[PDB]
């Protein structure tokens, strides 16, 4: 009978944020031992919400790509 | 100096609504006449926030693609 819509497909933000970081430091422009800024800051650059960035911090984490030590600081693996 | 973070790139999500809308009606899968569902149910269809939806609408009316009658409802064209 009528149409049914289906959901728009746009992927979750945290989602983007996750796999431009991955290649950035796959492909070499984020070295190894880098620091990324703090959270605030880096979401400011990449204009994004702080919990979406947030996030995708975490999946990288738990990759293995990054590492946050408990004093301060994530950095790349 | 330091590596200089640039924008997420995130389309606009009235912009990917406007797309897979015009997707459809090119496709055919929405024939000429038909009336899209009023704004609060197909946003709830599309699963998407009803500015969005409703600034998509605006773009393809604006391309022709649809047209909104005073009186109530918008109709593929």
Same mark, same amino acid.
């Given at each position: 009978?009528?149409?049914?819509?289906?959901?728009? =497909?746009?992927?979750?933000?945290?989602?983007?944020?996750? *796999? *431009?970081?991955?290649?950035?430091? +796959?492909?070499? #422009?984020?070295?190894?031992?880098?620091?990324?800024?703090?959270?605030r800051? +880096?979401?400011? *650059?990449?204009?994004? /919400?702080?919990? /979406?960035? $947030?996030?995708?911090?975490?999946?990288?984490?738990?990759?293995?790509?990054?590492l $946050? =030590?408990?004093?301060?600081? #994530?950095?790349?693996?």
């Open positions: 009978n009528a149409m049914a819509y289906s959901k728009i =497909r746009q992927p979750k933000l945290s989602d983007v944020i996750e *796999q *431009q970081l991955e290649f950035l430091i +796959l492909e070499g #422009t984020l070295r190894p031992g880098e620091k990324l800024p703090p959270e800051e +880096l979401a400011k *650059q990449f204009d994004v /919400s702080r919990p /979406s960035l $947030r996030e995708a911090i975490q999946r990288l984490e738990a990759k293995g790509l990054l $946050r =030590r408990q004093g301060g600081g #994530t950095f790349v693996q």
